[PDB]
Structure 1
């Protein structure tokens, strides 16, 4: 019958700047993972990309409650026999703050072909300055 379905390019996609100082790692990522998805628009369509672009600054000041700065471990395997490598969350925040936030959000997005598309929509900067001033983003206040 008659139910509205969006089309690629029909919905205007905006740019947002989110400041991430003091916010918990998983509380920030959960809200960002639904901005990219498009779950805040009545034009939502499950099979079409209709979200927004998100820029995250101050990625080095993210929050890690409790003993997560030492007891949280990130694992990687190279598929060679006995090639398991690990890094704590505390030093990852110190050295590579951009990788910590990308790994968290990437697990919060659908694990399909369109879920990879939304990942390329995210830019994370460990400092306080971003290179995307030509796109004229706005300041988005987290709820």
Structure 2
């Protein structure tokens, strides 16, 4: 029978919490790990978060296994220039609960952006990850550490050579337009017969 010890690590414990990028567990692979670059100039927050999470969790790999948590390191750039459609930065609420009574914190996207722009991207990545992995703390925490958020354009990850990941949004669609009218080109044999 498997047994998890009650004497686990804690945030107040002096040993502290580990980094899954530095850990050496069995279900953590590091060989097939590629570095992608994702520019967030203009791309919307939920769309860019979904695109980033699909490469973070390793879902784009054909050999993806739910147990083995493997993925690619995505470096998101220009998060300060991320764009959401109008009135959303003011209307979209972000709420959480603290241990104190009546501690229902409710902040706007504008407030979280003026506090730290990376917090918004991290929150949306957490949501997109918990959409599929919420049961295991491992499966819901280990992927997030593979995202390298950066407010401005500069970043120290120049040695890993991140490839400029290209992605197409599911919104592109051509509504039917009026058939343009143009002159017909005839033929001598057609005019003959």
Q: For the Cα contact (< 8 Å) 2:29–2:68, is it kept in 1?
A: no
Which protein is richer in helix relative to its size?
1
Which protein has the larger Cα radius of gyration, Structure 1 or Structure 2?
2
- Name which of structure 1's ranges 16-25 and 73-82 shifts more when overlaid on structure 2: 73-82
Task: Tell me, yes or no, if the aligned pair for 1:11 and 1:50 is still in contact at 8 Å.
Answer: no
**Aligned counterparts, 1:1-143, within 5 A:** 8-9=28-29, 11-109=31-129, 110-111=133-134, 112=136, 113-143=138-168
Listed as ranges, the gaps of 5+ residues in structure 1 are: 1-6
- The change in CA–CA distance for 1:80 and 1:22 in structure 2 (over 3 A counts) is same
- TM-score where L is the length of structure 2: 0.66
- Scaled by the length of structure 1, the TM-score of the pair is 0.87
The CA distance in 2 between the partners of 1:24 and 1:76, in whole Å, is 23
Q: Which runs of 5+ in 2 are unaligned?
A: 1-26, 169-193
Alignment: residue pair count: 137
Residue 10 to residue 124, structure 1, CA distance change in 2 (3 Å): closer
SS at match of 1:46: coil
Moved over 4 A (4+): none
Aligned to 2:20: none
